[PDB]
Design a protein around this ligand. Sequence first.
Ligand SMILES: CCOc1cc(OC(C)C)c(F)c([C@@H](Nc2ccc(C(=N)N)cc2)c2nc(-c3ccccc3C(N)=O)c[nH]2)c1
Ligand SMILES: [Ca+2]
Lengths: 254, 57
Amino acid sequence: IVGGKVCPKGECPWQVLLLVNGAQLCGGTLINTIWVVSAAHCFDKIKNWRNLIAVLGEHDLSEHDGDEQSRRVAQVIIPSTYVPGTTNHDIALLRLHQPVVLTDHVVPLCLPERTFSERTLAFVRFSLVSGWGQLLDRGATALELMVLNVPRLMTQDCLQQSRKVGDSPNITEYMFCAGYSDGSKDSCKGDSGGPHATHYRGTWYLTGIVSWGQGCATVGHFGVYTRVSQYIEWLQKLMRSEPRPGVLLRAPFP
Amino acid sequence: QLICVNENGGCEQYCSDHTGTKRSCRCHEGYSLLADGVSCTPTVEYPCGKIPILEKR
Ligand SMILES: CCOc1cc(OC(C)C)c(F)c([C@@H](Nc2ccc(C(=N)N)cc2)c2nc(-c3ccccc3C(N)=O)c[nH]2)c1
Ligand SMILES: [Ca+2]
């Protein structure tokens, strides 16, 4: 997170820390006691599927305070339409082996219904983005969980306000822009998979996933996020399924 | 007739349209609908999308 602040401990209780062989991999969002929503691109280079851990109630990486809860990831579900190394359909649904215990420091973010998310949440201008990613482009990652408030843009406006760059990926109906074009504030690669959380009438909802951008907080560019509303039914159906042997599962999308 | 299209039909969380001018508001799991028919109240200690340290202070 570039140009944000420390998220006070317990104020981002749905934030997930994903680890592989104990090493920081990505962010994620707890949506109930068993399920975590993240980015499909987080798993492009995974060889050790059995060493994937989701840590809940994490705040400071340098110390164990007793609020952290770790779970082994039993399954990583990715839509069939996602192509490794590309940007479209950047979503992953993660099943924890056992549920986490909800506490003051461990609370899910609401996965909203599609129509409510499209008609109401899509028009709440500001939303929070968080993670232990880079504090600067080509800089060190954060030791304490960081949070940033970002405004959402309509894709036509995002395209007009962005510097034209050759071979830049298309911003599809499965993505949205949020952030600033002045180089001051953005999410970064280390925040990948992390939440874009929207407030509505006293409750927070999942509307986006840290996905991609041209560098981090680059002048003339915005952060690009997975448009979660396009995946509500796909996620709901999978949450009702039985797990299958093998951690990685490619599921048909739609 | 269409109701949910207009200001989420007054619903705090989810809106459902029914035959005629009937509208039903719904809530996410861990919440129940109040008798006003629009508001949602938690049924559990840790409902989704609420920050306990902020809710308790
Ligand atoms: C579909 C992803 O598409 C991407 C395309 C990118 O570049 C475009 C071609 C322009 C790009 F830079 C990134 C990086 N993520 C972000 C994210 C946010 C912001 C931002 N400014 N908001 C910038 C960059 C990234 N994540 C990894 C990564 C992170 C953890 C585990 C594994 C990996 C991995 N797969 O290498 C490597 N690189 C992703
Ligand atoms: Ca810690």
